[PDB]
Amino acid sequence: DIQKQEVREAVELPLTHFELYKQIGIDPPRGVLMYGPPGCGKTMLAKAVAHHTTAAFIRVVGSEFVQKYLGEGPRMVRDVFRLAKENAPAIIFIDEIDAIATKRFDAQTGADREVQRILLELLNQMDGFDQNVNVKVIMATNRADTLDPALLRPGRLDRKIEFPLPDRRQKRLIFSTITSKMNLSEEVDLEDYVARPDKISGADINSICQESGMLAVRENRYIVLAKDFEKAYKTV
Amino acid sequence: LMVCNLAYSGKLEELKESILADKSLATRTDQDSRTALHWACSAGHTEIVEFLLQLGVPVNDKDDAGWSPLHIAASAGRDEIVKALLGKGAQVNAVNQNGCTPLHYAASKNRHEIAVMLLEGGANPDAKDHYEATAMHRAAAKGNLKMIHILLYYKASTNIQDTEGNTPLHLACDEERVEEAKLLVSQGASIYIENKEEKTPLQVAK
Amino acid sequence: GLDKQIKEIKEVIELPVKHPAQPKGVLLYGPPGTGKTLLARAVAHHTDCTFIRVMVRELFVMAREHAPSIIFMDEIDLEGGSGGDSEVQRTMLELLNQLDGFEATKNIKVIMATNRIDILDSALLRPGRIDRKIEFPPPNEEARLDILKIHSRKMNLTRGINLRKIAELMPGASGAEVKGVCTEAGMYALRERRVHVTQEDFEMAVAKVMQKD
Numbered sequence: 042d043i044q045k046q047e048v049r050e051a052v053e054l055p056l057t058h059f060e061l062y063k064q065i066g067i068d069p070p071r072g073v074l075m076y077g078p079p080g081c082g083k084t085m086l087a088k089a090v091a092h093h094t095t096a097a098f099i100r101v102v103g104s105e106f107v108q109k110y111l112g113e114g115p116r117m118v119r120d121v122f123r124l125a126k127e128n129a130p131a132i133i134f135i136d137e138i139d140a141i142a143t144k145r146f147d148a149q150t151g152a153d154r155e156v157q158r159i160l161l162e163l164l165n166q167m168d169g170f171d172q173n174v175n176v177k178v179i180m181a182t183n184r185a186d187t188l189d190p191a192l193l194r195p196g197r198l199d200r201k202i203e204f205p206l207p208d209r210r211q212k213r214l215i216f217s218t219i220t221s222k223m224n225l226s227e228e229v230d231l232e233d234y235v236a237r238p239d240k241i242s243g244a245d246i247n248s249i250c251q252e253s254g255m256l257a258v259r260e261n262r263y264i265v266l267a268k269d270f271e272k273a274y275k276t277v
Numbered sequence: 278l279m280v281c282n283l284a285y286s287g288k289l290e291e292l293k294e295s296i297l298a299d300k301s302l303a304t305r306t307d308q309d310s311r312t313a314l315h316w317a318c319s320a321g322h323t324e325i326v327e328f329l330l331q332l333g334v335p336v337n338d339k340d341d342a343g344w345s346p347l348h349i350a351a352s353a354g355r356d357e358i359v360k361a362l363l364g365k366g367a368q369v370n371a372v373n374q375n376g377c378t379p380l381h382y383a384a385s386k387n388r389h390e391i392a393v394m395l396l397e398g399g400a401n402p403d404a405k406d407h408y409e410a411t412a413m414h415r416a417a418a419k420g421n422l423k424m425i426h427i428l429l430y431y432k433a434s435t436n437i438q439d440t441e442g443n444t445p446l447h448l449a450c451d452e453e454r455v456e457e458a459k460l461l462v463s464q465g466a467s468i469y470i471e472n473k474e475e476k477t478p479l480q481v482a483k
Numbered sequence: 484g485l486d487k488q489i490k491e492i493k494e495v496i497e498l499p500v501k502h503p504a505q506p507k508g509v510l511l512y513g514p515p516g517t518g519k520t521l522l523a524r525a526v527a528h529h530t531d532c533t534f535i536r537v538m539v540r541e542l543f544v545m546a547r548e549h550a551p552s553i554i555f556m557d558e559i560d561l562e563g564g565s566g567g568d569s570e571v572q573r574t575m576l577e578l579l580n581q582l583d584g585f586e587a588t589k590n591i592k593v594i595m596a597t598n599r600i601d602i603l604d605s606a607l608l609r610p611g612r613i614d615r616k617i618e619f620p621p622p623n624e625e626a627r628l629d630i631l632k633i634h635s636r637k638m639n640l641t642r643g644i645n646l647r648k649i650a651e652l653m654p655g656a657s658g659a660e661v662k663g664v665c666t667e668a669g670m671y672a673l674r675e676r677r678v679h680v681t682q683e684d685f686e687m688a689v690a691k692v693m694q695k696d
Contacts, residue, residue: 227344230377233408264285
């Protein structure tokens with residue numbers, strides 16, 4: 042309601058204006074930051090933008106750039122950034138930055154120091170990527186206590202979307218947005234199903250309702266009920 | 278079963294012909310532990326449920342969880358089904374799976390007429406479920422001020438402690454409904470009740 | 484309200500420029516309004532010298548290959564904070580051991596930045612051997628009109644706007660709220676689509692930046 046609204050207003054509203062942003066040359070901050078260790082997230086919004094908007098999509102699970110070759114870093118991030126700035130307005134979804142964002146150990150091992158100096162180089166590149174460029178860098182993580190504030194500096198990641206647990210409002214509207222189209226009855230409840238999923242963490246609630254429709258699609262039960270809702274809770 | 282599609286789809290003459298062919302279909306049920314009254318009430322067909330209630334189908338039939346058709350009459354938003362079920366003697370305080378009453382599902386749907394009809398018949402405004410929550414919690418969180426006011430017409434309480442310890446004023450302040458907040462405070466809602474989080478209604482509001 | 488810091492900083496920083504001891508380091512403690520980065524980057528900009536911004540030992544490797552330069556701890560500005568911070572305090576201890584040991588060229592200094600008990604920890608790790616003490620007072624309005632002008636030369640501004648009310652009518656927390664009003668004024672400048680230099684819409688931006696304070 043405010044989470045997905047911030048994802049649309051922060052991602053898809055300036056996305057269509059890149060064809061104009063190449064002309065007027067005024068680029069807003071592209072940094073979108075998600076958070077919340079209890080809630081899974083990081084997939085319903087990337088898929089929601091992946092289906093709603095028709096643009097280039099470059100998803101990278103984790104840190105693909107941990108290759109032992111120190112000189113490969115600028116080639117990889119330079120290739121991704123050159124296909125982002127040249128190929129199409131690709132949306133770069135960098136997830137799980139906790140691995141490379143914090144130094145591990147063994148300072149004299151100039152591999153990590155050198156690739157974090159490369160991280161500072163591409164940091165100056167994303168400083169330069171605020172003017173006449175079709176760049177989109179959305180970011181997600183689960184633990185902010187180990188992240189260095191260099192990436193989270195004011196001016197780089199200005200969209201801090203918080204999602205510890207799904208609030209009751211998104212629960213009620215995500216149940217109404219699926220029971221409004223499917224069959225509705227009395228056994229479809231919103232109070233115990235707005236209170237219990239607030240205690241137990243559960244993602245893809247809409248997909249849980251669709252799987253419940255896949256458990257009531259047996260041509261024997263015609264209206265979805267709480268039996269397949271709680272059964273879908275204890276099974277998926 | 279067959280009466281599930283004959284009831285839900287609205288086959289009036291086909292369901293009457295099925296009942297006249299075999300009287301057992303009025304009480305037969307599928308795996309949902311529901312008879313044709315639940316399907317036709319869920320779909321909203323008044324004539325079928327007036328034929329079934331005319332023959333005298335037990336209105337207090339519960340499913341595997343304990344759901345009474347009055348919850349369909351309240352949640353579905355069908356006033357005439359409320360008139361028929363309350364006319365036949367439906368239980369206004371029937372306990373479902375989680376212990377809720379049809380007043381909760383009529384307040385959730387913002388159906389004022391169903392609230393006036395159910396509360397007129399002798400419903401409990403302060404009925405509490407397994408979570409110890411009333412209709413004023415969710416009606417105050419969804420933004421239903423007129424439902425709260427017509428609940429106050431029937432002497433409803435405004436200081437029910439939820440399973441977390443919150444009150445309807447807490448759920449009203451969480452939604453940032455300044456009209457519902459100031460109105461409930463003006464009506465006598467205790468701003469001193471603390472929940473498990475030790476947050477007063479003034480702290481929850483921003 | 485920053486004339487004392489430039490006046491006192493000219494004899495400290497500007498000493499090895501034309502006068503040829505040389506002070507090794509200096510620290511500024513207080514509310515981080517203005518003068519922590521804008522002063523080192525403004526003086527380092529008018530001087531036309533290099534100025535790179537700023538890991539517990541790898542930051543000392545960067546501060547080893549790039550040791551001769553104007554450095555300033557900007558990224559970091561008792562149980563785990565004294566040790567985790569004491570790693571960068573050790574980093575600048577051996578930095579002061581290099582600067583105190585030998586140098587390849589002049590005009591090489593490092594500026595510290597700390598505003599909490601770690602100032603007393605820095606004085607616990609610095610028994611008054613080689614360090615300069617310059618108090619960091621909160622910026623006055625005179626340090627806000629000129630920082631709004633310098634922070635307004637980049638963006639297009641109309642000739643009919645009154646900078647006195649928008650510059651003098653921002654009291655309270657710190658001077659970074661000026662830069663925040665600039666950036667938010669650019670986000671509402673993109674949001675509202677000012678045609679060329681429209682003044683009434685710039686006053687609308689004044690309202691949209693005064694409603695958040």
